[PDB]
Amino acid sequence: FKLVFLGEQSVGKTSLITRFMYDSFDNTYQATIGIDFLSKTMYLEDRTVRLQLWDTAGQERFRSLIPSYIRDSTVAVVVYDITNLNSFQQTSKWIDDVRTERGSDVIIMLVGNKTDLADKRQITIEEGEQRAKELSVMFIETSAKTGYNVKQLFRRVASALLE
Numbered sequence: 001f002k003l004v005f006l007g008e009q010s011v012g013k014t015s016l017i018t019r020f021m022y023d024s025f026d027n028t029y030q031a032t033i034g035i036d037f038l039s040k041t042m043y044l045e046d047r048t049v050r051l052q053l054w055d056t057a058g059q060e061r062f063r064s065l066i067p068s069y070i071r072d073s074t075v076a077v078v079v080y081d082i083t084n085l086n087s088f089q090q091t092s093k094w095i096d097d098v099r100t101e102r103g104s105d106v107i108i109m110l111v112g113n114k115t116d117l118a119d120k121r122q123i124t125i126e127e128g129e130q131r132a133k134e135l136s137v138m139f140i141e142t143s144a145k146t147g148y149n150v151k152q153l154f155r156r157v158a159s160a161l162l163e
């Protein structure tokens, strides 16, 4: 169970990890490409599974190494920001990367984060669901700030691993 978070800078990759792990949320920045992995044991389907969470850098000068991390990861979490059109379009790039340096022997979860910022939404939930189905990957919308669906994200991907 190795989960790698991918997506453009500031979609909220770290916040989602931080939310799931310590159930907290900080609104300041963390330019991330440092101190690289977190672990946690979680309950599900009558058992326990320990997950390994990998946090990566979406902003450029640091995508030269990411490939390896993707290659030996069992789950790729591709995140975008529902209020940022560019972050959504770029998910094709990240998804392309995963399959290219990993085959089809992988589980991919597309995540539309920051649902709390409704008055700034640029991508509807239907458009996200439709894109996930067209590319044959999983989909879920979240909010690291409110905690919305954060646990459902991990339970679902974890469930996908056991199945």
Ligand SMILES: Nc1nc2c(ncn2[C@@H]2O[C@H](COP(=O)(O)OP(=O)(O)O)[C@@H](O)[C@H]2O)c(=O)[nH]1
Binding pocket: 007, 008, 009, 010, 011, 012, 013, 014, 015, 016, 026, 027, 028, 029, 030, 031, 032, 058, 113, 114, 115, 116, 117, 142, 143, 144, 145, 146
């Ligand atoms: N409103 C809102 N802000 C968020 C959410 N998740 C992250 N952020 C904010 O977006 C900025 C970037 O988040 P960060 O986790 O560093 O993004 P990363 O670069 O993808 O890891 C920070 O200022 C966060 O506080 C969310 O669900 N809702």
Ligand SMILES: [Mg+2]
Binding pocket: 013, 014, 015, 030, 031, 032, 055, 056
């Ligand atoms: Mg980060």
